Symmetry: C2
Subunit: 198 residues, 2 copies
């Protein structure tokens, strides 16, 4: 049962793909790193997500191309692939529960595709916030608080935008009183409202 | 073994999620459908893909929220979910094979995410085209031919764009001779060179 301070790396592009991971607490960011140094987020994982699944494919004989980072402080479990395959026999039920975990991962990615598919960057941002409310939301007076410190830069890397654009967009939303920000945590008021339009 | 003609629906949003599917031949399009009929593609599936995985979470208890369409003529297998659980819990390693297929679905989707992250539509297009080269490509003398009829509208629905914009971009790519198109089949000339970028 391993822990990771916020922003520490769990695995680097190029590392052998030998382990599978289960997220216990916190959020994990998976990203692609381009030669220049720019990261694009491909996933923001919530608690109880299986990940590192490249290792279930070619296993130990192929390398990570994503970077996994503890987006908040993290606790997780991990095992080398050969150990996981075995525990599957000794438990043809664990097997079924993994299948459900991976199915959930698939559905979550598709939902981020929907988010990125919007032409209007504003709606893209609203749609991303809604996913976050679902994944990291905590109920409160004014609606739902996304329980993560979110920099504008981080939002930008997740919705294919730039810091500058995100700042402008978060501000348009605050003016309209549709969200609040305290210590970098976003509160979305009337979330079920916003769900309208898809 | 079932077959579906090109453009036939395999399942509609709101249909109970009762089966899991395995695509043997052809391409299947998963899309989100909006009140007025526009559709957004969330996946173009290639041969040998498990799909319909919502029913592994919930079986027929909940409903589909994506539209599954035969993007080309299609041949597939499908089984109700309890028949699957038995097949698995009764077949230990068949289960390791599913685990792998779902793993592959996850990585394919993440690549569509990388494709959509680009801010420049030209690059979304090229990047989408290169994925299609890997998924449905047939090699030939002038590079790789995407063995799919791809209308401009279908491309637009997959990369978050309008048709007019796709047409223009495809126009650019031909003028620059990075692709040619013949009868909706796109050939990418020197894809490995385009990959770098
Ligand atoms: O397994 C990889 O190497 C990256 C992590 C993942 F993208 F595969 C994931 O499980 O989503
Ligand atoms: O099962 C769904 O409802 C649609 C198809 C799928 F998203 F589930 C899939 O397996 O990608």
């Amino acid at each position: 049962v391993e822990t990771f301070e916020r922003n520490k790396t769990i695995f680097f592009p190029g590392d052998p793909a030998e382990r599978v991971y289960f997220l216990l607490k916190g959020a994990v960011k998976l990203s692609r790193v381009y030669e220049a140094g720019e990261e694009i987020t491909v996933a923001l994982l919530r608690e109880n997500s299986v990940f590192g699944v490249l290792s279930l494919l070619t296993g130990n004989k192929s390398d990570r191309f994503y970077h996994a980072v503890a987006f908040t402080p993290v606790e997780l479990l991990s095992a080398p692939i050969e150990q996981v395959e075995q525990a599957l026999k000794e438990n043809p039920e664990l097997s079924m529960l993994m299948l459900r975990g991976l199915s959930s991962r698939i559905l979550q990615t598709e939902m981020m595709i929907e988010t990125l598919a919007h032409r209007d960057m504003g709606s893209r941002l609203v749609s991303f916030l809604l996913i976050l409310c679902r994944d990291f939301g905590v109920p409160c007076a004014d609606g739902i608080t996304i329980d993560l410190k979110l920099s504008h830069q981080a939002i930008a890397e997740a919705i294919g935008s730039t810091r500058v654009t995100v700042t402008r967009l978060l501000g348009d939303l605050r003016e309209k009183k549709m969200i609040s920000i305290h210590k970098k945590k976003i509160t979305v008021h009337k979330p079920v409202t916003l769900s309208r339009q898809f």
